[PDB]
UniProtKB/Swiss-Prot annotation:
Disulfide bonds: none annotated. The gene is TRA1. Changing residue 90 to G: In TRA1-2. Defects in its ability to interact with acidic activators. It is found in: Nucleus. Although strongly related to the PI3/PI4-kinase family, it lacks the typical motifs that constitute the catalytic site of PI3/PI4-kinase proteins, suggesting that it may lack such activity. This is SAGA complex/NuA4 acetyltransferase complex subunit TRA1. Component of the 1.8 MDa SAGA (Spt-Ada-Gcn5 acetyltransferase) complex, which is composed of 19 subunits TRA1, SPT7, TAF5, NGG1/ADA3, SGF73, SPT20/ADA5, SPT8, TAF12, TAF6, HFI1/ADA1, UBP8, GCN5, ADA2, SPT3, SGF29, TAF10, TAF9, SGF11 and SUS1. Belongs to the PI3/PI4-kinase family. TRA1 subfamily. The lineage of its organism: Eukaryota, Fungi, Dikarya, Ascomycota, Saccharomycotina. The chain holds residues 3202 to 3328 of 3744 of the full protein. The C-terminal domain (2233-2836) is essential for its ability to interact with activators. Essential scaffold subunit of the transcription coactivator SAGA complex. SAGA acts as a general cofactor required for essentially all RNA polymerase II transcription. At the promoters, SAGA is required for transcription pre-initiation complex (PIC) recruitment. It influences RNA polymerase II transcriptional activity through different activities such as TBP interaction (via core/TAF module) and promoter selectivity, interaction with transcription activators (via Tra1/SPT module), and chromatin modification through histone acetylation (via HAT module) and deubiquitination (via DUB module).
Length: 114
């Protein structure tokens, strides 16, 4: 609240001092924020990783909530929709690893060609 208001009150007190640098670093911040911000099929490997790693984890720990999340993230996969469906329709963990690993196999094979 008022301390969170005091946080901005510091920020103005920050902005009041040496503000060219406060301009420039904020300018630096957004500059680096923008030009480096990239997701060119990167979430796809980030998806294939976090799923298959969680998936074999529970499989050795012993696919319902696995199938329930499988539609959930394929929804977040907004091309983007068909393989989200094609993985959602294609189950036991043995197929679920094997397809997603083969999916990761080409996705690594694709991204390495870049």
């Amino acid at each position: 609240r008022q301390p969170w208001e005091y946080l901005q009150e510091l920020n103005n007190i920050l902005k009041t001092a040496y503000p060219l640098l406060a301009l420039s670093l904020e300018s630096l911040v957004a500059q680096i924020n923008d030009r480096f911000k990239s997701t060119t099929d990167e979430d796809l490997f980030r998806l294939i990783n976090v799923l298959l790693i969680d998936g074999t984890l529970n499989y050795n720990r012993l696919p319902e909530n696995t199938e329930k999340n499988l539609v959930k993230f394929s929804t977040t996969l907004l091309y983007i929709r068909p393989k989200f469906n094609a993985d959602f329709i294609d189950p036991d963990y043995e197929t679920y690893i094997k397809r997603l690993r083969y999916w990761r196999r080409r996705l690594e094979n694709k991204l390495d060609r870049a």
